[PDB]
Design a protein around this nucleic acid. Sequence first.
DNA 1: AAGTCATGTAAGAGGGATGACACTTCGC
DNA 2: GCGAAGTGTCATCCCTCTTACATGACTT
Lengths: 116, 115
Amino acid sequence: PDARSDARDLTAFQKNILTVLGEEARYGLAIKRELEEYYGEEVNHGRLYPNLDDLVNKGLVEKSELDKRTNEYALTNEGFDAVVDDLEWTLSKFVADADRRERVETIVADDAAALE
Amino acid sequence: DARSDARDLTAFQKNILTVLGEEARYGLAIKRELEEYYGEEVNHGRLYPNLDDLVNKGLVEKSELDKRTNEYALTNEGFDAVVDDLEWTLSKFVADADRRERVETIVADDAAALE
DNA sequence: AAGTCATGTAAGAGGGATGACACTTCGC
DNA sequence: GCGAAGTGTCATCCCTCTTACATGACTT
Ligand SMILES: [Mn+2]
Ligand SMILES: [Mn+2]
């Protein structure tokens, strides 16, 4: 399977969900909480749990159980490709100049400093 | 703030801005690259409503190439929206060494395609 | 058992898409 | 003129989010 076919028509909310899981697997309300900080507003859980179940059936996210009241959601290999594919597509269109490039390099470098 | 504008944007609109980040284009030119991204035919009745809706938000400047042609381009505010949801996904992707190595290889293979 | 936590779920509501129909303008 | 390019517009479908209500599970 190729992620492009199933990961280029997702809503911004669904793409932001996969971006979150790209950092590491989280449970339902942990994704809700880190999405809420991006938007600056509340994220109605009635919007989150259905969007994650759609992302699950498409093969982008997997659903495992921590308790049985809690589910830890994590990207499938296809889902990881979905994030990589869209990141390649943005950098393709952002790295249009030598100036644009190193703006990315320092963006990465700064994020490399943030780990320890 | 850039995140304020960036956060409230359809995916179809984030794609329009990423298109204009590469180069300022005219209406249907944007359409054709969005068709090459989606693998779909992009209804122009959907391209122009949003395009003008991004001009209402201040992220796109609608100039005029010819009396029948418009040239769309990103504003400074428009470009800062693209930068900061680039920064957002890169902060979440760069989670370890191999994710950093992977990114900089993309930018390397990307920067080599500019000749 | 009490108070949460975590998730499931549907009706109505809300907002963009579809698929046309229209105008002007350019090139031959 | 004639065809096409480029864009403007909307009725309606379409689909998602909102906004609640709902349950079982973990902690004490
Ligand atoms: Mn909630
Ligand atoms: Mn069209």
